[PDB]
């Protein structure tokens, strides 16, 4: 499957298209609005590599109820890629996934 890489540096593979899944009704990728009016077309994938996390998980304005987010940045260039999502309870499946923002990745999905 097609590799997706950081748009800014194009030095790392972050994920592959075979990781894509639909978490809910809105297909594998949809537009979501953050608290300040930024719109992120967020693709959900089971596994991602070559990302670094900032800080600790938060449920604030979570787009996926039952999950907390942690900001995820390219390990090379520190560009914002998306968020790691982690379940806040045991009955959630999957227990973790990544939401990657379309505009941070190449190729364009």
């Amino acid at each position: 499957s097609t590799s997706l890489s950081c748009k800014q540096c194009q030095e790392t593979e972050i994920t592959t298209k075979n990781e894509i899944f639909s978490l809910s009704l809105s297909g594998p990728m949809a537009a979501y609005v953050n608290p300040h009016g930024y719109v992120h077309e967020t693709l959900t994938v089971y596994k991602a590599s070559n990302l670094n996390l900032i800080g600790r998980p938060s449920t604030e304005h979570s787009w996926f109820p039952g999950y907390a987010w942690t900001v995820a940045q390219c390990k090379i260039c520190a560009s914002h890629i998306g968020w790691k999502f982690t379940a806040t309870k045991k009955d959630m499946s999957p227990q973790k996934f990544w939401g990657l923002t379309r505009s941070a990745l190449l190729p364009t999905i």
Binding site: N34, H36, Y38, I54, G55, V71, A78, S79, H80
Partner: peptide
């Protein structure tokens, strides 16, 4: 511990000066 937040992605920072650079780099 990290009181400064980026309004585009939610990244948090202990130093406001690092927040300012981080916001710039979203461009």
């Amino acid at each position: 511990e990290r009181p400064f937040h980026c309004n585009q992605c939610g990244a948090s920072f202990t130093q406001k000066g690092n927040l300012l650079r981080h916001i710039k780099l979203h461009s």
